[model samples]
Each structure stands twice: as C-alpha cells, then as structure tokens.
Target chain A: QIEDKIEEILSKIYHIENEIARIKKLIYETNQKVDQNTSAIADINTSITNLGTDALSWDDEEGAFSASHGTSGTNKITNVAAGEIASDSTDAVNGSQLYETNMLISQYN
Target chain B: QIEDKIEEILSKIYHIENEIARIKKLIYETNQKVDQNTSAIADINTSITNLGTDALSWDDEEGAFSASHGTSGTNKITNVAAGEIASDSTDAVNGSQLYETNMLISQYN
Candidate 1:
C-alpha cells in the first residue's frame, strides 16, 4: 500500500509538470501575437500621417484648384463693353454773352 | 541508488511542469495585450475613415467668393470719343448727264 501511494504521487507530479509547461508555451505565443499587432498599428499610424499631410490645405496637390485647371480649354477670355451714355446738351442764350444750360445724360434714352 | 534516481526524475519533472505553467501564464497575458491593441487599431481605423470622408469633398463650405460695389464722386464718369475713319469719295458728273461726286468725312479735322 505504501508503494502504491508513492507511485500515485509520482504520476500526479508528472501531470502537473506537464500542465505548467503547456501553460508557459501558451503565454509565449500570446505575447508574440500581441507584438505583431502593435507593430501593425504603428505602421498604420505613420501611413495616415503621411497621407494627411499630402491631403489637406492650400498646398494640397490633389485638391480642387488643381483639378479644375487641369482640363483643357478651361481658361478663356472675352471682350465685353459697358453701355454708352448720351452726352449732355447746352442751349445758348442771347448773343451778348451767350449763357449755356446742360442736360443730364444716361446709358439709355 | 534507484530511490535517488527516482527522486531526481521527479525533481526534473517538477521543474519542467513549473516552467510550462509560467509560460502559459505569460501567453495568456500576451494574448490580452494583443486583443487590446487590436481593438484600438479598429477604433483608429474607423475614426480615420470618418475624418477622411469629411475632409475630401466638393461640399466644403469653407471656400469663399464675394464682391461689393460702391458709388460716390469718385465713381463719376467722363466722356471720351472714338476717332472716326475717313470714307471714300465719289465724284458727281454733270446733271442730266450731271454726274455727282460725294466725299466721305471722318470725325477728325
């Protein structure tokens, strides 16, 4: 009976040792995965920063101002004139020293 | 001697089991960290997408185009005339057989 008890204890010890080893390996693998994910997150952040710099503001190369002027024949000039006004008129008075009066003028009659 | 050997083996097994357990604990902790990092990455991605959509657009209300006009004595108009072109002249001869001549005139003296 004493021998049996010793053998049983030995077996239990072996099993416990195995379980502990397995748990340790699991922990190592989990840590490795976490590290990989962190690295990916860092890379993504860097890319976003670069893209943002290129995407916003007056110097933005890909913005609407550049795009609008990129099309052919988009810029052209034409001549237009404002309407004309009639000149004012003045009437002469008696010949001694003629007096003159004037009329207002406008673009249309 | 046999008993000593058995004891040695048990000790070795105990050590191995302990190591495995340590590793497993490490792995579990690492996995927790990885999950946290992954969640953060997902949140960042979502935020970036929302910001990008808001940033890139034709509907940007921040653009500007405005003008104003005012009138006073400073806005008064003055008259100017375009110079006239001289016309070709035609001669009139005798009347009956009196042909007539015409002269073209311009605004300039």
Candidate 2:
C-alpha cells in the first residue's frame, strides 16, 4: 500500500510541474505583447507633440490662435480658401481677395 | 521510512501551490494596468480622428489643405493673424488687410 501511494504522489507532482511550465509560457507571451504596445503608445504621443509646435499654434500674446509662425515675420499659411465676407467675420481671406480689390481700384484709376 | 517520504512530498506540494497563487496575483495586477492603458489609447485615437473632421482639413479637390469648411462659400476661418506678405507667397491674409486697403482706397475717393 505504501508503494502504491508513493506512485500516486509522483504522478501528481508531474502534472503540477507541467502546469507551472504552461503558466510561465503564458507570462512570457503576455510580456511581449505589453512591450510592443508600450512602444506604439510612445510613437503616437510624439506625433501629437509635434502638432503643437507647427506653424498653426495658440498665440499667448494675442490670446488667440496664430496661423503663421510667431512674430517671425516671414512664415505663411498657404493654400487657404477665401473666407466668408460679413461685417462680423473675423475670418482669414486669401490673397485673391486683395488682388481683385487692387484690380478694381486700378480700373477706376 | 515510508511515512517520512510522504511528509516530504506533502511539504513540497504546499510550496508549489503557494508559488502558483503568487503568480496568479501578479497576472491579475498586470491585467488591470493593461486595461487602463488600452482605454487611454482609445481616447487619444478618437481625438486625433476628430482633428481630421475639423474646419481645417485636407482638400482633396484642391490638392492642398483648406482652412475654411469648404467650397460652401459662407464658412470662414476666423482669428487668423496676418501671414507673410510676399510676391510668391500663397499665404492667407486676415480681414484686417482688406479692411485697411479699403480704408486707403476710400481716402483717395
């Protein structure tokens, strides 16, 4: 009877050892996934940070947004369409508006 | 001798069971962190997607970006400071430029 009981314990031990190995494998796989996700999140954060430093940014002095680089006096926000014409409009108008007005004035001159 | 062997096997099993429990607890904590990080990433992605649908967007028809809503002819890009003024510049100028020019033209008249 003692011999039989020893054999049973040995068998149970073998199964437990296999269970531990399986759990370890799962942990290794999960850690790989975690590392990859962390790297991806870092890349996305950097891209968002880059947007804040672009030509269009919040202007602290004007208490509004600026479309050109700050006070550089040379940067431009290109490819803008004409804005709505209204007395209350504070929209940015394209150069075409200025050109057309100049031409009309010249014609009168 | 048989009894002594049995006692030793029982002790070993108890230690193995404790080790397994410890590993399980660690996995549970790690999963909580992973879930929170995943939620944060989703929110950030949604915010970036919102930017694409904003007033300033890529203009597929013009092959350039549009500052206004579109060819709707009424939408305006407001709060834009004066862009760089140059012969070759395609920058969008603010309403102030047109207003100042109109004032000058009115003076001549």
Candidate 3:
C-alpha cells in the first residue's frame, strides 16, 4: 500500500512538471511575439515620422519654391513687360502693331 | 554510502526545482513589463498620429483662409474707386487742377 501511494505521488509530481514546462513554452512564445511586435512598431513609427516631416516641409515657401522652381530658373517669370517703343512716328498705328514693332525693334535697336 | 548518494541526488533535484521557479517568476515579470510598455507605446503612437493629422490639416485653404479672412468681407477690397465727379467743365477746376482732378477721378477706375 505504501508503494502504491508513492507511485501516485510521483505521478502528481510529473503532472506538475509538465504544467511548468508548458508555461515555460508559452512564456517563450509570448516573448518572441512581443519582440516581433516591437520591431514592427518601430518601423511603423519611422515611416510615419518621415512622411510627417515631408508633409510639413511642403508648407515652407523656400522649400516649396525650391521644389517648384527646381535647379534652373527657366520658368520662374510670373510677369514680364514688353519692349519699349523707340520712335513715336513709326509705321505702327495701334498699340498691338506698336507692340509687334517694338518687339522687332528690340532685336535691332 | 548509498544513502549519501541518494541525498545528493535529491538535493540536486531540489535545486533544479528552485531554478525553474525562479525562471517562471522572471517570465511573469517580463510579461508584466511588456504589457506596460505596449500600453505606453500605443498611447505614444496615438498622440503622434493625432498630431500628424492636425499638422496636415493646417495646409487646407478653408482652415487657413478662415483664420486669415474672418467671417466679414467689409475690409476685403484690394482696390477701391473713391467717388464720381459731377461735370466735365466746372469752375471748381483749373488746367493743372483739371489734370490732377482727372487723376483723382480716374485713379482706380
């Protein structure tokens, strides 16, 4: 009877050991999941910050102007005045004709 | 001599059990820290996203124009014609004064 009781106690101890092992395995897997989530969160945070900075930089006139104007100033002129009239008694009759004449005169005069 | 060896084996098993308990406790504490850090990081991410949304909304015309123009259009005119003159030939005007008055009449016309 005593030997039977000892065998039962050993079986109970074995069950407890199995429970402990299962808990250890669960804890290890949970730790691994947490580590993976942390890395994912870090990457997401970096992407959000970079996008935020780019969006903010759009508000700055200097930065926006640089983006619009580019390295060359080929198309930055918003308004340009026509060439001046040289002579009052030219063959040009109206302002439109004078404008054309002035443009032509600009090349020679 | 056999009793001494058995005692030594039992002591070693007891030491292993204690070590397993310590490891389990460590895992529990780590999980608790991970929970707290997860909550903290969630709050941080929420704040960052909210701030980013607000910063982006600042660029909208309705938001910016309302802040600049207000609700009234009373002082919104960029150019205004002052008033109209009565007659082309009036004793109230001289030649130079007529030229100056013409300027006053047609300044913003």
TM-score of each: 0.41, 0.72, 0.46
Model 1 residue B92 CA deviation (Å) reads: 68
iRMS per model, in Å, is 24.0, 4.2, 19.1
Better of 1 and 2 by DockQ: 2
Which regions in candidate 1 have their CA more than 4 angstroms from the true location? A1-43, A57-109, B57-109
Per-candidate total of colliding backbone pairs: 26, 0, 0
Can you tell me the DockQ of model 3? 0.06
> Comparing 1 and 2 by TM-score, which wins?
2
Categorize the docking of model 1: incorrect
Positional deviation of residue A63's Cα in model 2 after best superposition, in angstroms? 1.7
Better by lDDT, candidate 3 or 1:
3
Indicate the TM-score of model 3: 0.46
lDDT of 2 by residue, A14-88 (tens): 888887888888788778868877986897777576554442555597565444433454354446667654444
Runs in model 2 lying further than 4 Å from the true structure: A68-74, B52-76, B79-109
Q: lDDT of each structure?
A: 0.42, 0.67, 0.46
Candidate 3: tens digits of C-alpha lDDT, residues B24-75:
7887888888888778777877877765543322223222211112333211
* Per-residue alpha-carbon lDDT of candidate 2 for residues B55-83, written as tens digits (9 for 90 to 100): 35334364443455434533556766665
Order of quality (TM-score): 2, 3, 1
